[PDB]
Amino acid sequence: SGFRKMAFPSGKVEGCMVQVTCGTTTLNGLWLDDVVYCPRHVICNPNYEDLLIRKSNHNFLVQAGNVQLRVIGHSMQNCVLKLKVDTANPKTPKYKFVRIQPGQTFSVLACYNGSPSGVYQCAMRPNFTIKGSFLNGSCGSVGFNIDYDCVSFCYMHHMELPTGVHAGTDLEGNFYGPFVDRQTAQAAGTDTTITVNVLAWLYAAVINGDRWFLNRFTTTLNDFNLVAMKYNYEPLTQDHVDILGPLSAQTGIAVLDMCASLKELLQNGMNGRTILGSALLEDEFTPFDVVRQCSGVTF
Amino acid sequence: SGFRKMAFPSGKVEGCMVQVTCGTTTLNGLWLDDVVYCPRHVICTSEDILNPNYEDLLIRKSNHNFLVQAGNVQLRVIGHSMQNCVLKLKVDTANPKTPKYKFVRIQPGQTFSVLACYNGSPSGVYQCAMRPNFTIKGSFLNGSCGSVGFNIDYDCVSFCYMHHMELPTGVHAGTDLEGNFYGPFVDRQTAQAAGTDTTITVNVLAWLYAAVINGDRWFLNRFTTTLNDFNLVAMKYNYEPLTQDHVDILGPLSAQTGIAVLDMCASLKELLQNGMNGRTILGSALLEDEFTPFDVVRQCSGVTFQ
Ligand SMILES: *C(=N)[C@H](C[C@@H]1CCNC1=O)NC(=O)[C@@H]1[C@@H]2[C@H](CN1C(=O)[C@@H](NC(=O)C(F)(F)F)C(C)(C)C)C2(C)C
Ligand SMILES: *C(=N)[C@H](C[C@@H]1CCNC1=O)NC(=O)[C@@H]1[C@@H]2[C@H](CN1C(=O)[C@@H](NC(=O)C(F)(F)F)C(C)(C)C)C2(C)C
């Protein structure tokens, strides 16, 4: 037993990380087959479309470990630059590019000079930011899920907002949230709590013998969602209640039963108690995360 | 900016994990050059685990009683030897993916990454601390035994923990990679309970310095303290004594923030006296003790946000 904020094994992604230099700008690239993907801001209100067509190939210094890759082509896709190189990455995993929804979780491999430094677990916030841990040179660091042996890349890191939270794109260069890759004034919107994830975490508490917060009462979506949006919680939809099904049977607490416990916790707080060693309601574990860690699924 | 329970990238440990089978017992092993290291209780059956005589169970085994599997490849065992509570299986192939490594015994308070494994396949990576009472708060199911804890320093992997068992309080016990248990535990299903746990004071102070570095000062006060007055108060909250070594180790974080270690001790003292006042620090409503001074310096700017 035990419950931990657990990342995916980073091995397969570690094999894809390289260093990209264009002038004084250094950051991280993802080398898949014969293409390196990185933030287009490496070339730097700029003018990218124009800037890149001007720039020749030997201007992009691409270092993989000690080796250098020769760039035989460039091209823009939204906010990501694609650098064509002479050689396919022999360590290339089975992979795809996915776009995740807010509330969905993923593992970040934090990198500096194409060198992996750390791995942590993240949720795409409702306001399309992530609460990451990123310094200078972190740009091009990626977010991923692993499904059997297939790496789904969902995030590339671009920037830090003034509140200390982070913004990036999918691997096709589409931003998460209403942001731009320009030195301009940008803020995170007001965030909400991922209700379905809090409930999933309460089910993990129960599975691990942490049960003081349960009660006799049940509720309805309406009454709950009226209390929720008061405490800046996402609406719990009927889809959410379906996903929690597995955990509701496996424990014998009913989702609208668990909604009554969570209501009670929002109104009365914790009474100097913890749940799985937290004094806050944790919203960065999906139902899938909880079933996977409490089942022991491997990669 | 930001502050996360970061683990080390697991790739270099992933390439070492194998599955070890003895009769009906399968657990994970660690394949480094031509040796596979695993918990010796792989040779135990259901009837052995209360008073196993390992020397006696082992003398009754051939090399070919050990099935070792690295992905699809069954490796061939050519030698076996017990060292403390680890079995070492000599195999015909040296692991081509063996990293630069060493084995280290860590002290309570020290952190490391755990690669949770089942059937020699990795399930996930998380960060742990050796609790003062020599346990870890892991996430570990049936078959997780042989999973390892590690730090990475440039390219070199220091193996510090191997998982053996779960104690009645839901917390975990294991050995160094020389097979010597952390704490007063034994690889037997006999009555075993963890010492009462304590908060790792030096680590909480480190994490308060992290909070100042990311620009949060709401919990500082204008007081100082003697180390001894601080320790007299800290013991009353089940905090580990802070020693002069601990104060020395905090020197750098003190210099980066301009806040004296004993002034940070005055803040912690007040935080214990009052709690959070419905406020949080680095996203936690509790005082965090699983970040070392080395961790904070590693993950934090080097330039304080004010
Ligand atoms: C990539 N290597 C860095 C990562 C940053 C640095 C501090 N922590 C991080 O996550 N990315 C950048 O430097 C990007 C890059 C220009 C400016 N920038 C920022 O992150 C800046 N923020 C913003 O521009 C703002 F306000 F809009 F969010 C900075 C002020 C340096 C934090 C570009 C092209 C956006
Ligand atoms: C390794 N595969 C397991 C790991 C355990 C299983 C559940 N969670 C874990 O981390 N190791 C064992 O099953 C060891 C093994 C015999 C018994 N054992 C235990 O962990 C048991 N606990 C104890 O014996 C206790 F509490 F006294 F320390 C168990 C009750 C099954 C969790 C041996 C030889 C110690």
Numbering used by the authors:
A (entry chain B): 1 to 44, 51 to 305
B (entry chain A): 1 to 306
Reproduce text from the manuscript describing this model.
For nirmatrelvir complexes, we determined the crystals structures of the WT enzyme, as well as M49I, N142S, G143S, Q189K, A193T, and A193S mutants at 2.1, 1.9, 1.8, 1.6, 2.4, 2.5, and 1.9-Å resolution, respectively. In nirmatrelvir WT complex, the S2 subsite is occupied by the dimethyl-cyclopropyl-proline substituent, which interacts mainly by hydrophobic interactions with the main chains of R188 and the side chains of H41, M49, M165, and Q189. The same pattern seems to be maintained for all mutant crystal complexes, including mutant M49I. The mutations that affect P2 subsite residues M49 and M165 had a minor effect on nirmatrelvir activity. The structure of M49I in complex with nirmatrelvir showed that the mutation has also a minor effect on ligand orientation relative to the WT, where all key molecular contacts were maintained. Mutants M49I, M49T, N142S, M165I, R188K, T190I, A191T, and A193V showed higher susceptibility to nirmatrelvir, with Ki values ranging from 0.005 to 0.013 μM, a no more than 2-fold increase in Ki values relative to the WT. Mutants M49I, M49T, N142D, M165I, R188K, T190I, and A191T exhibited a catalytic efficiency significantly higher than the WT, with increments up to 2-fold, with N142D and R188K being the ones with the higher relative catalytic efficiencies.
